[PDB]
RNA sequence: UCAGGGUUCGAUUCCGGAGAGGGAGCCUGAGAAACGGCUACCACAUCCAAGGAAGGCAGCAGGCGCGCAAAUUACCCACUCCCGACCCGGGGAGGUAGUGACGAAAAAUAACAAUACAGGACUCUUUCGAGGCCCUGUAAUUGGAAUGAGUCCACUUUAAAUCCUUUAACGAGGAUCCAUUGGAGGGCAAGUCUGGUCGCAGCAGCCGCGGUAAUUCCAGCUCCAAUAGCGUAUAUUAAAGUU
C-alpha cells in the first residue's frame, strides 16, 4: 500500500537504511596509480581464450 | 670557508671617478655571505681600502656554488659622497633620513595653502 | 549549380545570401533581438527572484509522477517563471517567500524531459547550494 | 604578458584503441599524466607542420635553405635525428618515442645508476644528480647530445661524497641518546 | 576557432577620436570653447543666526544603489619619466606590497631490499615432480635509505620589507605530514553484484528506466575517466557540403 499521501517528498530517502564501511586503507595518487593500472592490465601477464570478462566482475 | 673573488668586464669610468666591475663569487659548501666580508677582499686586491668600496646585488643561484653582484670602487671618499644615491651611503651608515614617514607632509601642505602671509604656526604648530 | 558564375556578379551573390540567411531559424532570433524582449532573462546565465508558492506538476505520458515545482516572481522584471526543484526532499529546503537563484535546464529554450511548461530549475536558496543542504555538509543558516 | 598553451586535448573523449596507447606509453617512462604526453605530441605535430610547408616550396628558394639547414641542426643537437640523414624527408619519419629517450629520467635509467624508472624520477627531484656542474629538479630537461657525457651524481649528497641523510645520522644518535643516554 | 575558402568577437594597457550631471556662453594663454577655470539656466544635493554662502569622484582608494557579476580609505619617488627659476624641489603618473582556482607555465602526495605466495621463457626428469631465471602484484611484518611540506636562527633581497634562491637546528613507517570531482543500460571508457522502494519517491541533454525478481531510482561494496582540478548554466566557433 501507500498510506499518508503519495505526493509526500523525502519518502524513499527517509525510509532507507543508512550503513557504511568507510576505508582504513589509503589509496595512491599521481604516479603510482598509473603504475598499478599498467601492471594490473598488461604486465601480469594473464590473458587466455576469448572472453567477455571486463575489469570488473562482481557477478 | 675559503671563497674566491673573481673579476668580469672592468671599466675605468673617469667621468664619475670610479671603477665598476662585476663581483663574481664562488662559495663551495656555503653560499651567500655578508657583503661586508666581500669588500674586504676587494680592498686587498686593488689596495683602495674599504670605505670607498660599495657593492650590491648578489643573487645566489640554485644549489649554491656561485653568486654574482655589482661593485663600485671610488678613487676618493668625496667622489662617492657626492655622486652616490643616498640609500647606498646609508647602507653602511653615514647618513639617514628625516623627513619622517609619509603623509604628515601632505596634510600640512593643504593647511599651509589656506593661510596667507603667516604659515609659521602650521610649520610648527599644526 | 543552376546559378550565375559571372566575373562581375559579386553584387548578385552577396545580396542574395544576405536575404536567404533570414529563412534560417537560428540567425533570425539572434539579430532581431525579439529573443531578448520575449525572454524573462536578459540573456544572463542566471537570475534571481522571490518565491510565490509551491505547486505540483503532472507528467506527460507514458510516465506518471508528480514533480513538485515552484513558481517564482523575479526581482528585475516582476514577471513569473515556473521552475523545477531537483533531488528528493529538496522541496522542504525551499521555504515560501524567500529568494532563490534560477538557471536554465540545458536545452536553451525548450522544455526538457516528460515535464511540460517548465524551462528553468533552481540552484541556490540563500547563498547555499542544494547539494550541501541535501548531502548534509551544511545546515540552514536560519 | 604573453602566455600560451603547450598541449591540446583529443577530439574524441573516449576510444578503446587510443587509451591503451597513452596508458602503456606512460607505464614505460613513469610519466605522471597524459598532459605530460600530449605536451610532447604538440611540439612534434608543430615540427611536422613546419616541415610540411618547406617540401612544397620551390627547391633552392632562399627561405627553404636557411630554415632547413638551421632546423635540422637543432634536431641533431638534441639527438632525435642523425646527420647521416640530414634532409627534410626524415622529419616525417620522426615520431613520438624518440623524444622520450632524450628525457632526463630516461637517460638516468638507461645509461646510469638507478633501479626501475620509478626510482630514477625520485632521485632527480631529491637533488642527487647534476648536469655538468648544475643541480636540476626537472625530469623534463630534454638533454642536448653533448651533455650526455657529463651526467653525474651531485657533489653534495650521501650518494658519493657529502654529508649523510637524517635517517643515518638519526640512528647514529640512537647510539648516543637512544641507547647511550636513553 | 580554423585543411583550403571562412565565421565570430574587438568596452579594455599601443595609436586616433569624443566627453567630464544635462545645455549654452566666455576669460586667460602660443595652444582650451578647459570643467582639479569662470558665468547663467535646468535637474540634484549641502551649510545658515534665514541676512546669505558653498558643490560636481566617467583621477587613486572608499560608500550607497544596481544587479548573475568584480580587490587595500596600504607602502614609497629608489627605478621609469614628466614638470620648475632647478645637479637640490614635487608627482595616488609610476614602482612596491595586500586580496586573487579569470587564465598560463613548473610538478609532490613513497621509492628500495628481506621473507611469503604468484606467473612464464630456461634446466633436470618418461611424465609427476624439482631446480632456477626474469620479473609481477599481494599478504605479513619489518629493515635499511632518502627528501621537502611545515617550523625556523643567519645571510641575501629592497626605498624599507615580504617572496624567491642560499644555509643552521628540528621535521615521514602509512592508523597518518590523508586528492578530489563525476560516472558504470545504449550513444561513451566501467556491475544481467547485495539491501531498500514498487509507475510512489526519483533518475533521464537524447533514446528511455520505476506497476514487488529495478544491470538506469535511494544506499553499500567494487570498478571506470580526468586529476590539483572536475562539474553545472549561458554567449560563440568547429562538427554544418543543415546558408
XYZ file of C-alpha atoms (C1' of nucleotides) in Angstrom:
752
model
C 0.000 0.000 0.000
C 0.762 3.694 0.123
C -0.653 5.465 3.154
C -0.066 9.090 4.052
C -0.209 10.598 0.610
C 1.882 9.745 -2.422
C 2.631 13.435 -3.012
C 4.956 13.256 0.039
C 8.631 14.037 -0.578
C 11.597 12.621 1.285
C 9.767 9.285 1.013
C 12.350 6.889 -0.469
C 15.324 8.542 1.244
C 13.766 8.794 4.702
C 12.806 5.115 4.971
C 16.051 3.592 3.678
C 18.694 2.157 5.969
C 21.973 4.041 6.234
C 25.125 1.965 6.569
C 28.796 2.328 5.681
C 32.124 0.540 5.724
C 34.453 3.520 5.348
C 38.072 2.836 4.445
C 41.089 2.492 6.684
C 43.218 1.796 3.606
C 44.918 4.714 1.875
C 44.747 4.772 -1.922
C 47.551 6.004 -4.169
C 47.693 9.197 -6.192
C 49.635 10.707 -9.091
C 52.374 8.435 -10.428
C 51.781 5.144 -8.605
C 48.056 4.989 -9.500
C 49.130 4.778 -13.176
C 51.894 2.275 -12.319
C 49.377 -0.176 -10.826
C 46.991 0.433 -13.748
C 49.756 -0.511 -16.227
C 50.935 -3.664 -14.432
C 47.486 -4.978 -13.469
C 46.157 -4.834 -17.042
C 49.065 -5.662 -19.337
C 52.160 -6.808 -17.427
C 50.870 -9.729 -15.371
C 50.534 -11.494 -17.996
C 47.316 -13.499 -17.566
C 45.003 -13.402 -20.719
C 43.514 -16.640 -22.080
C 40.793 -17.690 -24.591
C 38.126 -15.247 -25.886
C 36.005 -13.958 -23.048
C 33.800 -11.055 -22.077
C 35.108 -10.514 -18.601
C 35.771 -6.762 -18.204
C 37.984 -5.321 -15.456
C 35.031 -5.539 -13.074
C 33.024 -8.660 -12.371
C 31.118 -8.955 -9.115
C 28.728 -11.319 -10.892
C 85.135 28.689 4.202
C 87.609 29.809 1.575
C 85.957 31.872 -1.136
C 87.087 33.338 -4.450
C 86.615 36.881 -5.701
C 86.921 36.941 -9.455
C 86.708 39.854 -11.865
C 84.440 40.412 -15.158
C 84.326 43.277 -17.655
C 86.165 46.174 -15.994
C 85.655 49.828 -16.846
C 87.661 52.876 -15.852
C 84.749 55.270 -15.526
C 86.675 58.545 -15.433
C 83.610 60.821 -15.657
C 82.209 59.582 -12.320
C 85.732 58.894 -10.980
C 85.209 55.233 -10.182
C 85.951 51.731 -11.385
C 82.980 49.461 -11.931
C 83.144 45.728 -12.476
C 81.091 42.625 -11.657
C 81.649 40.847 -8.344
C 81.673 37.183 -9.351
C 81.958 34.997 -6.275
C 82.202 31.254 -5.768
C 81.446 29.570 -2.472
C 81.928 25.791 -2.145
C 79.725 24.210 0.578
C 78.151 27.507 1.572
C 76.922 30.452 -0.364
C 75.509 33.884 0.460
C 77.933 35.573 2.854
C 77.720 39.207 4.164
C 78.567 41.993 1.708
C 80.907 43.480 4.329
C 83.270 40.478 4.095
C 83.347 40.740 0.281
C 84.590 44.346 0.094
C 87.467 43.472 2.497
C 88.950 41.074 -0.040
C 88.491 43.566 -2.882
C 90.224 46.170 -0.679
C 93.291 43.935 -0.630
C 93.124 43.280 -4.369
C 93.398 46.898 -5.550
C 94.708 48.493 -2.331
C 91.985 51.161 -2.187
C 90.809 50.361 1.394
C 87.215 49.515 2.374
C 85.221 52.717 2.801
C 85.260 53.822 -0.845
C 84.176 50.357 -1.977
C 80.437 49.874 -2.406
C 78.755 46.699 -3.578
C 75.200 45.445 -4.064
C 73.238 42.814 -5.998
C 74.384 39.319 -5.043
C 71.686 36.887 -6.084
C 72.643 33.309 -5.431
C 71.969 30.541 -7.933
C 70.326 27.189 -7.136
C 72.345 24.671 -5.110
C 74.788 27.453 -4.168
C 78.207 27.354 -5.803
C 78.089 30.839 -7.290
C 76.744 34.303 -6.513
C 77.120 37.384 -8.725
C 76.885 41.053 -7.749
C 77.966 44.501 -8.867
C 80.606 46.665 -7.214
C 81.962 50.187 -7.460
C 85.326 51.434 -6.190
C 85.778 55.200 -5.943
C 89.141 56.957 -6.055
C 88.356 59.138 -3.045
C 85.544 59.447 -0.497
C 84.176 62.801 -1.670
C 83.556 61.492 -5.225
C 81.329 58.784 -3.719
C 79.726 61.074 -1.132
C 78.679 63.495 -3.891
C 77.540 61.095 -6.592
C 76.069 58.066 -4.770
C 72.282 57.714 -4.248
C 71.571 58.348 -0.583
C 70.360 54.892 0.488
C 73.638 53.273 -0.684
C 75.618 55.676 1.517
C 73.266 54.998 4.429
C 73.567 51.231 3.697
C 76.670 51.258 5.846
C 75.833 54.291 7.897
C 77.000 57.837 7.440
C 73.619 59.314 6.517
C 69.996 58.809 7.475
C 66.534 60.111 6.586
C 64.183 62.590 8.256
C 61.993 63.702 6.817
C 59.714 61.232 8.601
C 57.457 58.541 7.142
C 54.816 59.767 4.690
C 51.578 61.755 4.890
C 52.453 64.265 7.611
C 53.678 66.242 4.624
C 50.529 66.463 2.506
C 48.051 67.252 5.309
C 50.338 70.116 6.379
C 50.668 71.363 2.791
C 46.923 71.765 2.268
C 46.667 73.589 5.643
C 49.523 75.958 4.666
C 47.611 76.614 1.416
C 44.634 78.124 3.268
C 46.596 80.855 5.076
C 48.438 83.824 3.611
C 51.294 85.909 4.993
C 51.936 83.758 8.061
C 52.259 79.991 7.870
C 54.766 79.663 10.713
C 52.091 78.285 13.056
C 51.279 75.377 10.690
C 55.014 74.689 10.117
C 55.492 74.350 13.718
C 52.129 74.359 15.163
C 49.555 72.307 13.236
C 24.654 24.614 -59.632
C 21.893 26.329 -61.616
C 23.062 29.832 -60.783
C 25.383 32.578 -62.023
C 29.125 32.135 -62.286
C 29.969 35.517 -63.797
C 33.130 37.505 -63.096
C 31.279 40.731 -62.245
C 28.435 39.119 -60.287
C 29.727 39.895 -56.768
C 26.674 42.047 -56.082
C 24.135 39.433 -57.185
C 25.822 36.857 -54.925
C 26.393 38.913 -51.777
C 22.852 40.384 -51.792
C 21.161 37.027 -52.382
C 22.976 35.340 -49.495
C 22.154 38.238 -47.176
C 18.443 37.638 -47.886
C 18.262 33.839 -47.823
C 20.084 33.750 -44.468
C 16.961 35.090 -42.728
C 14.993 31.910 -43.517
C 17.300 30.116 -41.049
C 15.675 29.846 -37.607
C 18.801 30.482 -35.540
C 20.001 33.616 -37.356
C 16.552 35.237 -37.214
C 16.459 35.114 -33.399
C 19.976 36.460 -32.848
C 19.750 39.616 -34.930
C 16.170 40.828 -34.429
C 16.573 40.776 -30.642
C 12.934 39.640 -30.214
C 14.598 36.873 -28.178
C 15.697 39.396 -25.525
C 12.346 41.195 -25.284
C 10.281 37.993 -25.048
C 12.529 36.066 -22.609
C 12.252 36.505 -18.815
C 16.073 36.587 -18.862
C 18.152 39.417 -20.304
C 20.420 36.775 -21.844
C 22.039 36.380 -18.414
C 23.013 32.837 -17.429
C 21.138 33.014 -14.125
C 18.610 35.309 -12.496
C 17.176 35.840 -9.037
C 13.628 36.028 -7.777
C 11.361 35.531 -4.783
C 9.100 32.506 -4.225
C 5.341 32.799 -4.737
C 4.285 29.312 -3.928
C 4.920 25.623 -4.325
C 2.953 23.621 -6.911
C 2.639 20.053 -8.147
C 3.101 19.453 -11.870
C 1.797 16.327 -13.601
C 3.921 14.320 -16.032
C 3.414 13.596 -19.728
C 2.551 10.012 -20.721
C 3.681 7.202 -20.572
C 5.359 8.374 -17.338
C 3.211 9.244 -14.344
C 4.654 11.136 -11.417
C 4.175 14.404 -9.540
C 7.203 16.603 -9.945
C 6.887 19.267 -7.192
C 7.998 22.515 -8.822
C 7.755 26.067 -7.509
C 6.550 29.290 -9.066
C 8.628 32.416 -8.638
C 8.430 36.143 -9.472
C 11.649 37.935 -10.486
C 13.460 40.916 -8.955
C 14.232 42.891 -12.077
C 11.212 42.228 -14.292
C 8.425 41.313 -11.885
C 7.207 38.611 -14.300
C 6.674 34.982 -13.421
C 8.611 31.816 -14.178
C 7.881 28.225 -13.208
C 10.978 26.434 -12.033
C 11.793 22.794 -11.252
C 13.316 21.670 -7.966
C 15.916 18.809 -8.158
C 16.503 15.713 -5.932
C 14.300 14.052 -3.299
C 13.407 16.120 -0.233
C 14.978 19.326 -1.589
C 11.497 20.880 -1.787
C 11.483 21.117 2.025
C 14.731 23.139 1.977
C 12.907 25.800 -0.065
C 10.568 27.849 2.097
C 7.919 30.239 0.762
C 8.639 33.989 0.426
C 12.416 33.721 0.343
C 14.829 34.390 -2.504
C 16.176 31.717 -4.828
C 18.521 31.580 -7.814
C 17.294 30.055 -11.066
C 19.031 28.702 -14.153
C 18.019 27.074 -17.444
C 17.840 23.297 -17.892
C 20.489 22.784 -20.551
C 18.420 22.790 -23.727
C 18.430 26.582 -24.055
C 14.802 27.306 -24.843
C 12.739 24.152 -24.811
C 11.013 22.119 -22.133
C 13.051 19.124 -21.088
C 12.029 15.551 -20.409
C 8.486 14.471 -19.632
C 7.606 17.628 -17.677
C 5.841 20.305 -19.806
C 5.656 24.062 -19.191
C 8.904 24.206 -17.204
C 12.050 25.678 -18.749
C 14.028 26.586 -15.618
C 15.384 24.956 -12.468
C 16.760 26.141 -9.113
C 20.345 26.005 -7.822
C 20.803 28.101 -4.636
C 18.322 29.060 -1.942
C 20.245 31.687 0.037
C 23.988 31.618 -0.668
C 23.927 27.900 -0.028
C 23.719 25.142 -2.589
C 21.062 22.446 -2.966
C 23.953 19.951 -2.795
C 25.222 20.875 0.667
C 21.638 21.086 2.008
C 20.914 17.623 0.536
C 24.177 15.916 1.482
C 24.379 17.421 4.949
C 27.749 19.173 4.965
C 25.893 22.430 5.649
C 22.728 23.343 7.517
C 20.033 26.027 7.137
C 21.579 29.402 8.179
C 18.403 30.496 9.995
C 52.001 39.434 -20.529
C 52.477 36.697 -23.135
C 51.225 33.199 -22.391
C 50.128 30.250 -24.489
C 49.256 26.578 -24.081
C 51.758 23.792 -24.693
C 49.283 20.958 -25.279
C 45.934 20.086 -26.837
C 43.175 17.644 -25.898
C 41.990 14.739 -28.121
C 38.925 15.347 -30.319
C 37.300 12.096 -29.187
C 36.671 11.833 -25.411
C 36.975 8.042 -25.286
C 38.194 5.397 -27.688
C 39.421 1.991 -26.508
C 42.288 1.996 -29.034
C 43.666 5.422 -28.087
C 43.528 4.992 -24.298
C 45.654 1.812 -24.290
C 48.447 3.504 -26.247
C 48.501 6.502 -23.901
C 48.409 4.206 -20.855
C 51.174 1.811 -21.924
C 53.383 4.738 -23.044
C 53.028 6.345 -19.595
C 53.903 2.992 -17.969
C 57.311 2.713 -19.662
C 58.636 6.181 -18.868
C 56.971 6.762 -15.496
C 55.034 9.871 -16.578
C 52.505 11.372 -14.179
C 49.634 12.281 -16.529
C 48.518 12.384 -20.148
C 49.311 16.130 -20.014
C 52.976 15.030 -19.997
C 52.259 13.034 -23.194
C 50.132 15.475 -25.212
C 52.802 18.136 -24.491
C 55.350 16.081 -26.486
C 52.867 15.415 -29.260
C 52.026 19.124 -29.668
C 55.718 20.008 -30.254
C 56.114 17.074 -32.652
C 52.965 17.850 -34.661
C 54.108 21.516 -34.785
C 57.506 20.445 -36.233
C 55.633 18.111 -38.636
C 53.650 21.137 -39.867
C 56.632 23.418 -40.476
C 58.431 20.655 -42.431
C 55.260 20.021 -44.478
C 55.493 23.616 -45.754
C 59.090 23.613 -46.947
C 58.763 20.459 -49.092
C 56.110 22.246 -51.196
C 58.246 25.395 -51.580
C 60.473 25.618 -54.668
C 63.809 23.782 -54.439
C 66.588 26.332 -53.907
C 64.295 29.043 -52.658
C 66.396 31.032 -50.102
C 63.662 30.642 -47.443
C 63.744 26.847 -47.820
C 67.527 26.555 -47.489
C 68.170 28.767 -44.438
C 65.283 27.307 -42.427
C 66.025 23.635 -43.161
C 69.794 23.895 -42.502
C 69.341 25.544 -39.094
C 66.311 23.373 -38.218
C 67.998 20.002 -38.804
C 70.994 21.171 -36.730
C 68.649 21.538 -33.753
C 67.117 18.087 -34.248
C 70.670 16.682 -34.428
C 71.839 18.785 -31.420
C 69.217 17.093 -29.189
C 69.885 13.745 -30.857
C 66.443 12.738 -32.135
C 67.865 12.758 -35.666
C 71.155 11.741 -37.294
C 73.405 13.665 -39.677
C 73.626 10.521 -41.827
C 70.083 11.561 -42.766
C 70.195 15.373 -42.915
C 67.219 16.156 -45.124
C 63.637 17.162 -44.585
C 62.014 13.847 -45.590
C 63.321 12.168 -42.412
C 61.427 14.730 -40.274
C 58.232 12.901 -41.243
C 59.815 9.564 -40.286
C 60.456 11.015 -36.810
C 57.882 10.004 -34.206
C 56.911 10.369 -30.577
C 59.075 7.807 -28.804
C 62.467 9.113 -29.957
C 61.998 12.363 -27.983
C 61.218 10.460 -24.783
C 64.608 8.692 -24.986
C 66.278 12.095 -24.520
C 64.298 12.858 -21.350
C 66.444 13.143 -18.229
C 64.759 10.334 -16.232
C 65.088 8.024 -19.258
C 68.840 8.700 -19.544
C 69.455 8.247 -15.799
C 67.911 4.755 -16.054
C 69.335 3.777 -19.459
C 72.942 4.885 -19.057
C 73.467 5.440 -15.351
C 72.678 4.315 -11.863
C 69.090 3.531 -10.972
C 66.729 0.680 -10.210
C 63.377 0.755 -12.073
C 62.399 4.011 -13.861
C 60.039 4.892 -10.941
C 63.125 5.159 -8.696
C 65.057 7.355 -11.118
C 62.469 10.185 -11.173
C 62.675 10.462 -7.367
C 66.489 10.824 -7.478
C 66.131 13.798 -9.879
C 63.693 15.569 -7.577
C 65.520 14.865 -4.316
C 68.594 16.682 -5.737
C 71.049 13.789 -6.108
C 72.129 14.470 -9.694
C 73.638 17.285 -11.713
C 74.203 18.046 -15.372
C 77.819 19.115 -15.802
C 78.016 21.404 -12.757
C 74.393 22.294 -12.189
C 71.738 20.712 -9.938
C 68.368 20.005 -11.578
C 64.910 19.077 -10.309
C 63.161 18.828 -13.659
C 62.851 15.332 -15.269
C 61.779 17.080 -18.492
C 65.217 18.594 -19.113
C 65.382 17.296 -22.611
C 69.066 16.675 -22.813
C 71.356 18.000 -25.566
C 73.651 15.465 -27.217
C 76.919 16.999 -25.916
C 75.689 16.902 -22.281
C 75.206 13.112 -22.149
C 78.878 12.627 -21.254
C 78.589 14.935 -18.251
C 75.657 13.320 -16.422
C 76.996 12.614 -12.929
C 75.687 12.441 -9.363
C 75.854 15.562 -7.180
C 78.873 16.642 -5.171
C 76.832 17.268 -2.028
C 74.799 14.164 -1.392
C 75.027 10.941 0.617
C 75.347 9.271 -2.820
C 79.033 9.870 -3.333
C 80.896 12.393 -1.157
C 78.954 14.795 1.052
C 77.071 14.804 4.353
C 74.770 11.810 5.213
C 70.969 11.995 5.478
C 68.785 12.307 8.569
C 67.945 8.561 8.645
C 71.580 7.545 9.134
C 72.688 10.357 11.460
C 69.460 9.856 13.456
C 70.395 6.187 14.044
C 73.961 7.317 14.872
C 72.441 9.484 17.637
C 70.415 6.429 18.748
C 73.825 5.047 19.681
C 74.310 8.077 21.962
C 70.842 9.175 23.132
C 68.685 6.161 22.260
C 70.880 3.552 23.913
C 73.830 5.676 25.045
C 71.849 8.019 27.283
C 68.265 6.913 26.684
C 38.133 28.966 -33.925
C 40.079 27.003 -38.492
C 42.644 21.533 -44.198
C 41.509 25.038 -48.321
C 37.687 29.101 -48.501
C 35.591 31.276 -43.897
C 32.762 32.552 -39.321
C 32.513 35.266 -34.757
C 34.399 38.992 -31.411
C 37.260 43.867 -30.642
C 34.360 48.341 -23.502
C 39.809 47.009 -22.410
C 47.336 48.543 -21.435
C 49.607 50.997 -28.403
C 47.653 54.955 -31.969
C 43.460 58.301 -33.406
C 38.655 60.418 -31.540
C 34.791 62.194 -28.232
C 33.135 63.612 -23.195
C 33.583 65.246 -17.813
C 25.441 65.895 -14.073
C 22.412 67.930 -18.588
C 22.748 72.609 -22.123
C 24.848 77.428 -23.517
C 28.228 81.439 -23.176
C 33.097 83.297 -22.002
C 38.068 84.864 -19.587
C 43.467 83.816 -19.711
C 47.284 81.996 -22.969
C 51.397 80.327 -28.262
C 47.946 76.423 -27.596
C 41.330 75.481 -24.223
C 35.139 76.977 -26.158
C 39.229 73.969 -20.355
C 35.442 71.916 -16.085
C 41.370 69.818 -10.273
C 38.962 77.898 -14.782
C 34.698 81.101 -14.680
C 29.229 82.903 -15.562
C 23.939 81.636 -16.360
C 19.721 78.302 -16.958
C 17.792 73.243 -15.958
C 17.972 68.534 -12.859
C 20.191 67.415 -7.963
C 22.301 67.988 -3.161
C 24.946 70.776 1.496
C 25.511 74.579 5.420
C 22.858 79.007 7.728
C 21.999 83.252 13.333
C 17.384 82.555 7.232
C 20.529 88.140 6.131
C 23.390 84.753 2.853
C 27.262 81.033 1.395
C 29.382 76.867 -0.847
C 29.466 71.935 -4.627
C 30.220 68.224 -9.221
C 34.926 61.058 -7.660
C 33.489 58.599 -16.112
C 41.565 60.722 -11.023
C 43.615 56.824 -6.595
C 41.219 54.484 -2.524
C 36.234 54.178 -0.240
C 30.454 54.122 0.441
C 25.292 53.617 -1.185
C 22.414 51.757 -5.121
C 22.009 48.315 -9.259
C 22.328 43.641 -10.476
C 24.138 36.515 -12.080
C 28.670 39.645 -11.726
C 34.149 42.158 -9.946
C 40.112 43.943 -4.734
C 43.503 47.934 0.097
C 40.075 54.713 2.759
C 48.023 50.003 2.330
C 53.798 51.428 1.441
C 57.184 54.825 -1.456
C 59.660 58.907 -5.535
C 64.712 54.107 -5.267
C 63.553 52.557 -10.598
C 60.936 54.671 -15.341
C 59.720 59.525 -16.988
C 57.442 64.375 -16.590
C 57.010 69.479 -14.595
C 60.145 74.275 -12.484
C 63.728 79.747 -11.807
C 66.198 73.629 -10.931
C 72.640 68.624 -10.188
C 68.978 70.132 -4.619
C 62.011 70.570 -5.104
C 57.148 67.976 -6.457
C 54.229 63.898 -8.792
C 47.836 58.073 -5.988
C 51.833 59.298 -13.272
C 54.556 55.214 -11.966
C 57.096 51.468 -8.907
C 56.274 48.112 -4.355
C 53.186 45.037 -1.195
C 47.802 43.066 0.043
C 43.193 40.480 -1.919
C 43.203 36.938 -6.324
C 41.325 28.453 -8.539
C 39.733 34.770 -14.866
C 43.771 32.370 -17.207
C 49.030 30.335 -18.273
C 53.922 27.629 -17.060
C 56.551 24.097 -13.443
C 55.383 19.206 -10.952
C 54.990 16.235 -4.612
C 51.287 13.054 -2.276
C 56.773 6.699 -1.400
C 60.986 4.790 -3.613
C 64.365 0.267 -2.482
C 65.661 -4.743 -0.237
C 64.183 -9.413 3.204
C 60.663 -13.121 3.752
C 55.665 -15.028 1.595
C 52.616 -16.751 -2.281
C 52.000 -15.939 -7.737
C 53.314 -16.273 -13.327
C 56.199 -17.830 -17.716
C 60.963 -18.401 -21.039
C 65.210 -21.798 -19.093
C 67.312 -26.739 -16.818
C 66.873 -31.834 -14.998
C 63.162 -35.831 -15.224
C 59.148 -40.811 -19.380
C 55.798 -37.684 -17.022
C 54.726 -36.469 -11.944
C 57.859 -33.508 -9.535
C 62.234 -30.458 -8.506
C 65.759 -26.714 -9.506
C 66.108 -21.845 -11.484
C 65.830 -17.136 -14.145
C 63.238 -12.861 -15.471
C 60.177 -10.188 -13.279
C 54.962 -9.110 -11.124
C 51.405 -7.829 -7.960
C 49.883 -9.490 -2.986
C 49.992 -10.878 2.336
C 52.930 -10.423 6.659
C 55.691 -7.654 9.459
C 59.870 -5.071 9.066
C 64.679 -3.307 7.823
C 67.957 -0.080 5.799
C 67.992 4.532 2.828
C 66.251 9.376 1.054
C 63.761 14.210 0.829
C 60.654 18.874 1.162
C 55.724 20.023 3.224
C 55.987 22.610 7.661
C 58.505 25.030 11.954
C 62.852 28.193 11.934
C 68.434 31.451 13.800
C 71.624 33.668 9.949
C 72.802 35.736 5.196
C 70.506 37.838 0.775
C 66.561 40.684 -1.427
C 64.689 46.314 -1.337
C 63.244 52.969 -0.595
C 62.359 49.953 3.961
C 60.500 44.894 3.921
C 57.918 40.391 2.131
C 58.582 36.326 -1.525
C 62.393 33.577 -4.146
C 67.243 31.376 -4.192
C 71.180 30.144 -0.114
C 72.045 27.961 4.707
C 71.853 26.146 10.829
C 68.652 23.342 14.090
C 64.048 20.233 14.402
C 60.957 17.627 10.637
C 57.720 10.531 7.359
C 56.551 3.819 8.988
C 51.440 4.673 6.471
C 46.416 4.152 11.717
C 48.938 9.421 9.355
C 52.903 15.059 7.062
C 45.414 11.798 4.300
C 43.025 14.056 -3.585
C 39.188 15.159 -5.104
C 35.214 15.794 -8.956
C 31.836 12.898 -11.966
C 30.197 8.218 -13.947
C 29.190 2.477 -14.566
C 21.594 0.249 -19.865
C 22.996 2.410 -25.141
C 25.310 6.822 -27.556
C 30.667 6.568 -24.443
C 35.687 4.318 -21.248
C 33.279 0.917 -16.391
C 28.323 -4.218 -12.314
C 22.241 -9.024 -16.191
C 26.739 -7.791 -7.527
C 23.944 -7.064 -2.301
C 19.983 -4.357 0.714
C 15.622 -0.826 0.400
C 11.485 1.346 -2.677
C 7.217 -0.750 -6.188
C 4.663 3.854 -12.002
C 5.111 6.033 -5.329
C 9.587 8.671 -4.418
C 13.109 9.916 -8.179
C 16.503 9.422 -12.404
C 16.702 10.753 -17.640
C 20.939 16.586 -22.776
C 18.644 12.125 -26.167
C 16.647 7.098 -26.568
C 14.185 5.639 -22.023
C 14.232 3.470 -16.590
C 10.106 2.723 -11.742
C 3.153 -1.136 -11.876
C 7.090 -6.284 -5.530
C 12.912 -10.691 -9.338
C 14.864 -2.317 -10.968
C 22.397 -4.151 -14.684
C 19.452 3.098 -15.129
C 15.902 5.213 -8.515
C 17.727 5.515 -2.825
C 22.303 3.146 -0.210
C 26.701 -0.467 0.481
C 30.828 -2.788 -1.924
C 33.653 -2.998 -6.371
C 35.123 -0.789 -10.977
C 35.992 3.339 -14.843
C 37.612 8.558 -16.596
C 40.264 13.083 -15.745
C 43.315 14.922 -11.909
C 45.071 19.999 -8.420
C 41.491 20.062 -10.631
C 36.407 18.481 -12.061
C 31.039 19.524 -12.589
C 26.828 22.920 -13.990
C 24.354 27.355 -16.635
C 24.850 30.947 -20.875
C 27.070 33.585 -25.168
C 30.022 31.789 -29.548
C 33.122 28.816 -33.137
C 34.301 23.804 -35.149
C 31.181 19.399 -36.223
C 27.337 22.087 -40.698
C 28.547 20.481 -48.281
C 21.990 21.695 -42.344
C 23.437 29.037 -45.889
